[PDB]
Design a protein around this ligand. Structure first.
Ligand SMILES: O=C(O)[C@H]1O[C@@H](O[C@H]2[C@H](O)[C@@H](O)[C@H](O)O[C@@H]2CO)[C@H](O)[C@@H](O[C@@H]2O[C@H](CO)[C@@H](O)[C@H](O)[C@H]2O)[C@@H]1O
Lengths: 212, 214
């Protein structure tokens, strides 16, 4: 019944900067705990009993608070610290969790590397034709993708998926798939993937002709 | 060398049952209290069971009467027996070790998780398609129309680590689709072989598809 509300829900910090996140509670709790979950991984304990560093945890991590209000602090932000941070409360009815603060590292702006792939011959023999576009290793995260079929925009049948900030180089990647039947695919010739990112004022374009 | 390996996950129809297990190594199992915590598809964390020194067990209201936690201090295994499941029980199930010296309670090691899906939809294996088209070249692999999650994608039986990332699955009404990409030097491919190895545990499927030029 004690609700933990973390803020802000997303935040972004430059390298070497100091960062603080907050956990406000619906009423008093005895102790607060902090966990870190990197993309693809299991949660990891950072701070226990509101202010104690858990074994193995770098010294730049700190906790405090009391009553209904608690915080976690990173004194000097580093790239390996990009992750989602959760608080958890102990009290007479313990073990409710906050929703998470997602923390990204700022890095140098990077333009996407764009690739487009026509359907495989295996897919065509079953009557299907997926056209796939990868947009790899960009920063910042905000990006738009346009599909053009024979020079005109197409919006139906399009599915996007985005990755998390890579822990290694801190970039983002994106996938866009346009799924058609073999028959719709063979009634057009030019397929084009159009990416607009703030790193460039004109769009990055890749394309193929079905009969080339 | 503390290790927690969960297993038992899968797909269940609503109202069925399932038993999870967790195999612990590298510490004196019997000396520690243990918990199960799950992460939902929206990524909220949710405590579901504890067993504490002395054998007392505790559960939140939404699972009381349906879940039962227990332990085997001989072979160092933790269990979660789940019964009368509902669609809201779909999650990643983690097993955790409880901190010993604390004024409260907290979980100082987590396993890697075992995935549970509760749904009337039917198990369906994936179709796997190759993505073939500069000093570097990008190749890929399309994994279309499976249920439930997850699928596992590797490149050249793990031989390729850098240059690989896999996009989260997207669910299109009852079937998942995902894609995986890898980048290699132009002088590596096509003169050598690139294969994506896909595994789907739910359906007992394992395919290896070669990427070939056009
Ligand atoms: O571990 C748990 O999940 C339960 O822990 C109980 O506290 C234990 C603690 O784990 C031990 O380390 C210590 O030695 O003894 C404590 C004995 O209390 C909590 O009491 C329990 O919290 C909740 O308690 C309610 C009654 O107070 C009960 O209604 C809740 O169902 C129970 O979750 C906690 O769950």
């Amino acid at each position: 019944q004690i609700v933990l509300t973390q803020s802000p829900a997303i935040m972004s910090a430059s390298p070497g900067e100091k960062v603080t996140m907050t956990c406000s509670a619906s009423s008093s709790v005895s102790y607060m705990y902090w966990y870190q979950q990197k993309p693809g991984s299991s949660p990891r304990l950072l701070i226990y009993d509101t202010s104690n560093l858990a074994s193995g945890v770098p010294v730049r991590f700190s906790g405090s608070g009391s009553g209904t209000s608690y915080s976690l602090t990173i004194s000097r932000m580093e790239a390996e610290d990009a992750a989602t941070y959760y608080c958890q409360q102990w009290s007479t009815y313990p073990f409710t969790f906050g929703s998470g603060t997602k923390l990204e590292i700022k890095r140098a702006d990077a333009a996407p590397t764009v690739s487009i792939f026509p359907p495989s011959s295996e897919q065509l023999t079953s009557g299907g034709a997926s056209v796939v576009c990868f947009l790899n290793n960009f920063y910042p995260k905000d990006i738009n993708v346009k599909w053009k079929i024979d020079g005109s925009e197409r919006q139906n049948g399009v599915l996007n998926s985005w990755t998390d900030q890579d822990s290694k180089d801190s970039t983002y990647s994106m996938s866009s798939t346009l799924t058609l039947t073999k028959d719709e695919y063979e009634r057009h010739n030019s397929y084009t993937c159009e990416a607009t990112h703030k790193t460039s004022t004109s769009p990055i374009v890749k394309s193929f002709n079905r009969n080339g | 060398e503390v290790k927690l390996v969960e297993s038992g996950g899968g797909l269940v129809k609503p109202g069925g049952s399932l038993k999870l297990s967790c195999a612990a190594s590298g510490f004196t199992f019997s000396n520690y209290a243990m918990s199960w915590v799950r992460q939902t598809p929206e990524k909220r964390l949710e405590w579901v069971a504890s067993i504490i020194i002395g054998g007392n067990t505790y559960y939140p209201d939404s699972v009381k009467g349906r879940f039962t936690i227990s332990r085997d201090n001989a072979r160092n295994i933790l269990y979660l027996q789940m019964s009368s499941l509902r669609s809201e029980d779909t999650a990643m199930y983690y097993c955790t070790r409880r901190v010993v010296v604390t004024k409260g309670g907290a979980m100082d090691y987590w396993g890697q998780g075992t995935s549970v899906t509760v749904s009337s939809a039917k198990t369906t294996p994936p179709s796997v398609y190759p993505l073939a088209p500069n000093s570097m070249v990008t190749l890929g692999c399309l994994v279309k129309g499976y249920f439930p999650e997850p699928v596992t994608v590797t490149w050249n039986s793990g031989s390729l680590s850098s240059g690989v990332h896999t996009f989260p699955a997207v669910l299109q009404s009852d079937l998942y689709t995902l894609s995986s990409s890898v980048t290699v030097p132009s002088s590596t491919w096509p003169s050598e072989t690139v294969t994506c190895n896909v595994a789907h545990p739910a359906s007992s499927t394992k395919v290896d598809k070669k990427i070939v030029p056009r």
